[PDB]
Amino acid sequence: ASFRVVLDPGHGGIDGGARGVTGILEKDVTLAFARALRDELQKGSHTIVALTRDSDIFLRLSERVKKAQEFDADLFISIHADTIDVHSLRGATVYTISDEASDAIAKSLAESENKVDLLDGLPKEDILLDLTRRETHAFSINFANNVVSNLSKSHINLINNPHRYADFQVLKAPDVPSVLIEIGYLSNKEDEKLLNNPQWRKQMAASIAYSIRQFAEYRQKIMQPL
Amino acid sequence: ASFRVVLDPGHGGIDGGARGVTGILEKDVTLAFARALRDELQKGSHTIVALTRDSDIFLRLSERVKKAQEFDADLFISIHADTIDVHSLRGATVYTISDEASDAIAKSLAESENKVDLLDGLPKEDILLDLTRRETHAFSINFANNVVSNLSKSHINLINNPHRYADFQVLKAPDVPSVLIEIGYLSNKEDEKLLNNPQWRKQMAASIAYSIRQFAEYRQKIMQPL
Ligand SMILES: [Zn+2]
Numbered sequence: 369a370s371f372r373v374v375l376d377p378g379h380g381g382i383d384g385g386a387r388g389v390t391g392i393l394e395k396d397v398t399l400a401f402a403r404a405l406r407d408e409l410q411k412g413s414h415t416i417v418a419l420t421r422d423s424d425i426f427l428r429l430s431e432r433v434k435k436a437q438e439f440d441a442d443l444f445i446s447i448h449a450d451t452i453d454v455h456s457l458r459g460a461t462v463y464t465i466s467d468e469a470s471d472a473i474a475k476s477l478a479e480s481e482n483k484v485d486l487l488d489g490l491p492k493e494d495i496l497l498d499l500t501r502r503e504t505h506a507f508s509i510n511f512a513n514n515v516v517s518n519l520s521k522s523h524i525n526l527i528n529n530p531h532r533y534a535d536f537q538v539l540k541a542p543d544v545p546s547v548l549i550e551i552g553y554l555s556n557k558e559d560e561k562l563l564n565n566p567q568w569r570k571q572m573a574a575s576i577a578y579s580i581r582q583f584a585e586y587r588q589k590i591m592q593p594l
Numbered sequence: 595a596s597f598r599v600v601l602d603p604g605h606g607g608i609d610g611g612a613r614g615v616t617g618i619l620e621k622d623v624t625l626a627f628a629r630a631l632r633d634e635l636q637k638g639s640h641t642i643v644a645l646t647r648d649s650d651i652f653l654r655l656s657e658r659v660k661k662a663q664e665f666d667a668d669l670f671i672s673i674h675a676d677t678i679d680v681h682s683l684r685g686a687t688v689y690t691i692s693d694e695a696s697d698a699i700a701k702s703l704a705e706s707e708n709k710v711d712l713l714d715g716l717p718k719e720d721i722l723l724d725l726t727r728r729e730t731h732a733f734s735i736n737f738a739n740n741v742v743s744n745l746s747k748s749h750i751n752l753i754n755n756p757h758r759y760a761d762f763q764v765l766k767a768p769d770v771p772s773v774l775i776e777i778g779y780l781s782n783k784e785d786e787k788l789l790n791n792p793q794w795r796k797q798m799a800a801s802i803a804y805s806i807r808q809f810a811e812y813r814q815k816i817m818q819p820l
Pocket residue numbers: 378379385386394448449450481
């Protein structure tokens with residue numbers, strides 16, 4: 369069966385996201401990275417990919433989640449390259465959702481990343497469900513773990529404690545495993561140099577694509593009892 | 595939190611299980627292995643272990659499952675060293691439950707292993723539930739995968755296609771992740787030599803204990819939304 373993946377290039381349109389010292393914008397880096405990851409996935413077999421946006425447009429976080437659900441996604445990956453409070457912090461990071469943040473950096477990052485909805489100048493927006501949520505979370509965690517493992521094997525630099533968590537609204541799908549990947553932090557000058565290198569970006573995308581293939585193979589082993 | 599594991603030494607009492615050429619009995623090997631795995635787990639931190647039997651007694655498969663549930667187990671491992679139809683087949687194997695067998699060897703093995711209940715000479719014995727079952731199965735699969743991965747890293751010999759599946763009644767807990775591990779096959783002369791070596795058994799138990807620790811760390815990352 370074809371495994372279904374939705375990629376969400378963070379920011380877009382009026383929301384440029386973080387800005388590097390060279391002028392490079394997060395919204396452009398995330399779209400370029402998403403396109404590279406799509407390409408890597410499409411080189412493989414049995415993965416069908418869609419992007420929340422494949423152009424420079426603004427989308428509310430809830431609309432990104434809705435697109436993943438409308439696609440019947442098996443996995444949702446939101447792609448970012450943010451500024452964080454400490455400029456010395458650098459390296460790939462994977463975040464999953466949690467009410468309680470793993471640490472102060474993660475907490476502050478989610479607070480800021482959730483607020484971008486307001487940039488359009490418009491206002492802010494069951495047991496069976498809770499069980500589904502728990503199952504989804506197990507999958508999100510599994511994927512995050514695998515991504516970190518394979519990035520490490522590929523000698524791609526990871527931040528200390530590279531699996532973190534906080535209350536990211538873009539990760540709220542109750543029924544689609546979801547992670548947010550910081551490919552690097554535009555607040556760090558060394559990460560900015562990696563982020564603007566398309567060959568480095570391709571190498572990271574290739575590692576994530578491998579992780580996705582492994583996750584697909586795992587998911588397809590699981591029973592369907594309904 | 596203390597991760598809760600129930601180990602099930604296959605067979606027991608009137609059911610000797612498979613018999614090696616040296617006279618060694620499966621029921622004795624599985625109890626010895628379970629005790630070694632208990633010891634390895636108890637050397638670690640944060641694992642609480644119980645055995646379905648810690649003596650030479652016969653237990654129906656349903657009673658083994660009930661004991662896992664009564665203990666509020668987070669993981670159930672049934673330990674075996676069976677005879678299979680092809681004597682040239684050897685190596686550690688992990689089985690998970692499925693209505694449809696992975697292959698003819700797995701199918702025949704489950705048929706035979708389910709029939710042991712009859713050795714006492716007595717007769718043979720919901721959406722929310724189905725969802726719980728699906729979640730449990732994801733965990734069973736995850737653990738099986740990790741066990742195979744770590745056995746390989748430890749240079750412990752694995753059978754070809756070392757993750758298999760069939761309709762094993764001892765793996766029927768809807769709410770406890772469950773696997774059946776063949777530590778080797780007493781139908782194979784080389785496996786018999788490994789099986790009777792307590793140092794080799796200890797090395798395999800140590801690898802499984804490591805896999806359990808990794809599984810515990812994973813399980814404890816997952817949300818509790820109820
Ligand atoms: Zn961002």
